[PDB]
Amino acid sequence: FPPGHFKDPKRLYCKNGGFFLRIHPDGRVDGVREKSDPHIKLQLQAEERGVVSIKGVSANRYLAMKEDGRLLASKSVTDECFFFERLESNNYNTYRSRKYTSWYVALKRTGQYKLGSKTGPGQKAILFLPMS
Numbered sequence: 001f002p003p004g005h006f007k008d009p010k011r012l013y014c015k016n017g018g019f020f021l022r023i024h025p026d027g028r029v030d031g032v033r034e035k036s037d038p039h040i041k042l043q044l045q046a047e048e049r050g051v052v053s054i055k056g057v058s059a060n061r062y063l064a065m066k067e068d069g070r071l072l073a074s075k076s077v078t079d080e081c082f083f084f085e086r087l088e089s090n091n092y093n094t095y096r097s098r099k100y101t102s103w104y105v106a107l108k109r110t111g112q113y114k115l116g117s118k119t120g121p122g123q124k125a126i127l128f129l130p131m132s
């Protein structure tokens, strides 16, 4: 990924229903289709080669996957906030937990997050297009 991918804030558009990933100041995570929603502007940070954290800019919190597969957002970049970022077949990205290595960040067609343990590499739910 080129430097601009990290420098410019992104909205993460999920292929599964067209929901943008939304991170809230209370720690909640969900999805919304409205592009002007104030809590869908995210910052991708290169933590290591191929590894990112995902910060909700307004929320001032980082996306975390918990040990039971839930998505929340933390004030600090804990070990639950590191994700392998990978490019898939139609140029959407996936985000796989560095801690729970079989589980992906994902949104259901209902607009709520999909439990990590119910995700998989071939699901539409795990595909996100970073948009400006």
Ligand SMILES: CO[C@@H]1O[C@@H](C(=O)O)[C@@H](O[C@H]2O[C@H](CO)[C@@H](O)[C@H](OS(=O)(=O)O)[C@H]2NS(=O)(=O)O)[C@H](O)[C@H]1OS(=O)(=O)O
Residues within 6 Å of the ligand: 016, 017, 107, 108, 109, 110, 114, 118, 122, 123, 124, 125, 126
């Ligand atoms: C092609 O897109 C995937 O498959 C869709 C589908 O099978 O209709 C759709 O899946 C959602 O609806 C189906 C049918 O009701 C559910 O079986 C599925 O739940 S499940 O994955 O837990 O079994 C449900 N997936 S969800 O939206 O992620 O909750 C969906 O557009 C795509 O599903 S996928 O799992 O993201 O690939």
